[PDB]
């Protein structure tokens, strides 16, 4: 997973606190992330975001 892509996704979830799986996937691809699934998994691993039911929440 690319480091610039990690920084792009982090900034995205900071501005969008709770976002659905499908909107997040669409919006991350729009900001140049071809594989948002991989970046999202890494952000969960890092404790940046948590996964609910088809929704991602910024841990804070
Ligand atoms: Gd939780
Ligand atoms: Gd959760």
Residue numbers in the entry: 11 to 70
Show passages lifted from the paper.
Rather, it exists as a stable heterotrimer in which the apo-enzyme PolB1 associates with two subunits that we term PolB1-binding protein (PBP) 1 and PBP2. The PBP1 and PBP2 proteins are conserved in the Sulfolobales and other members of the crenarchaeal phylum and so, since the majority of our studies of the replisome have been performed with proteins from Sso, we chose to study the Sso orthologues, the products of the SSO0150 (PBP1) and SSO6202 (PBP2) open reading frames. In conclusion, over 30 years after its first characterization, we reveal that Sulfolobus PolB1 is not a single-subunit enzyme as was previously believed, but rather is a heterotrimeric holoenzyme. We speculate that PBP2 may facilitate polymerase activity via its interactions with the knuckle on the thumb domain of PolB1, conceivably influencing the position of the tip of the thumb domain and modulating the interaction of this domain of PolB1 with the primer–template junction.
PBP2 was crystallized and the structure determined by multiple wavelength anomalous dispersion (MAD) phasing technique. We note, however, that we cannot detect any direct interactions between PBP2 and either single- or double-stranded DNA.
